[PDB]
Design an enzyme around this catalytic site. Structure first.
Site, PDB file in Angstrom:
ATOM      1  N   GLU A  42      39.336  35.727  23.194  1.00  0.00           N
ATOM      2  CA  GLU A  42      38.565  36.147  24.345  1.00  0.00           C
ATOM      3  C   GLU A  42      39.575  36.729  25.311  1.00  0.00           C
ATOM      4  OE1 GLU A  42      36.585  34.010  28.204  1.00  0.00           O
ATOM      5  OE2 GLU A  42      36.414  33.015  26.261  1.00  0.00           O
ATOM      6  N   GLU A  72      38.697  37.203  36.320  1.00  0.00           N
ATOM      7  CA  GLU A  72      37.810  36.104  36.648  1.00  0.00           C
ATOM      8  C   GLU A  72      38.070  35.635  38.059  1.00  0.00           C
ATOM      9  OE1 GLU A  72      38.281  33.559  32.847  1.00  0.00           O
ATOM     10  OE2 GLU A  72      36.326  33.091  33.749  1.00  0.00           O
TER      11      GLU A  72
END
Ligand SMILES: [Ca+2]
Length: 251
Positions: free
Chosen positions: A123, A128
């Site tokens: 991933e 984020e």
């Protein structure tokens, strides 16, 4: 040719209405998304994913929806466009609010490496941000050997003072040798392909030689987004995306 980043895919969000279905699909559901998230990710709902004024707005909403107290959008190019290696840029203004968890990231098209889909096949977290810790952006990779479950995930952060007030180009340059994270082309982290330096290193340490697609969402709460609770007044929260641009390196 001259060696340069060649544009291969982009959405400049220069249109009006729902995210272009040729470029974008949706993750739909409120099952927690592996993080105990509180939102219901909706499909083709203008309240959660609308394009206009030159941007995409992914919007987190506090509302009673399909058993959930919040709705949101998780926009993906899964099934639409995926890439192996490239420069990936997402120019975005991040949402504010304790309980918000906007993410710009990537997951692998396939489980190439067994025996699970995640984290075995990786991933790539391009950007984020969590509202309860405003202005700090994380770039992170998850692999079989390096993931949040083992606490062994590899990533860095960079404070972007005006992340929630202004647009910032969140980018990775993912190549056969490493992944590099940039904010406005501030390199704040890089993840070397350990297979190229360590004979014992394999897909467990670098699974990033396979096609990944892009994901953009605002989670509400859950494990990371909501460990200071969810400020209900923080809604609606908007992840606003000027553009997504994907390049491939040509030599
Ligand atoms: Ca735009």
């Amino acid at each position: 040719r001259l060696p340069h980043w060649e544009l291969v895919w982009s959405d400049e969000f220069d249109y009006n209405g729902l995210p272009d279905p040729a470029k974008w699909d949706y993750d739909v559901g409120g099952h927690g998304w592996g993080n105990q998230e509180l939102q219901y990710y909706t499909r083709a709902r203008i309240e959660n994913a609308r394009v206009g004024g030159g941007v995409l707005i992914i919007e987190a909403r506090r509302e009673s929806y399909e058993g959930r107290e919040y709705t949101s959008a998780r926009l993906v190019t899964r099934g639409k466009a995926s890439w192996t290696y490239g420069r990936f840029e997402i120019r975005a203004r991040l949402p504010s609010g304790r309980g918000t968890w906007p993410a710009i990231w990537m997951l692998p098209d396939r489980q190439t490496y067994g025996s699970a889909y995640w984290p075995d096949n990786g991933e790539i977290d391009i950007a984020e941000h969590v509202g309860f810790n405003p202005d700090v952006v994380h770039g992170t990779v998850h692999t079989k050997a390096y993931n949040h479950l083992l606490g062994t995930q590899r990533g860095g952060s960079i404070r972007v003072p005006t992340a929630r007030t202004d647009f910032h180009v969140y980018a990775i340059e993912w190549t056969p040798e490493e992944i590099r994270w940039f904010v406005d082309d501030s390199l704040y982290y890089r993840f070397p392909n350990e297979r190229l330096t360590n004979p014992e290193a394999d897909w467990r340490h670098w699974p990033f030689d396979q096609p990944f697609h892009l994901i953009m969402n605002i989670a509400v709460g859950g494990t990371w987004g909501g460990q200071q609770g969810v400020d209900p007044e923080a809604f609606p929260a908007q992840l606003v995306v000027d553009y997504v641009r994907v390049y491939r390196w040509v030599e």
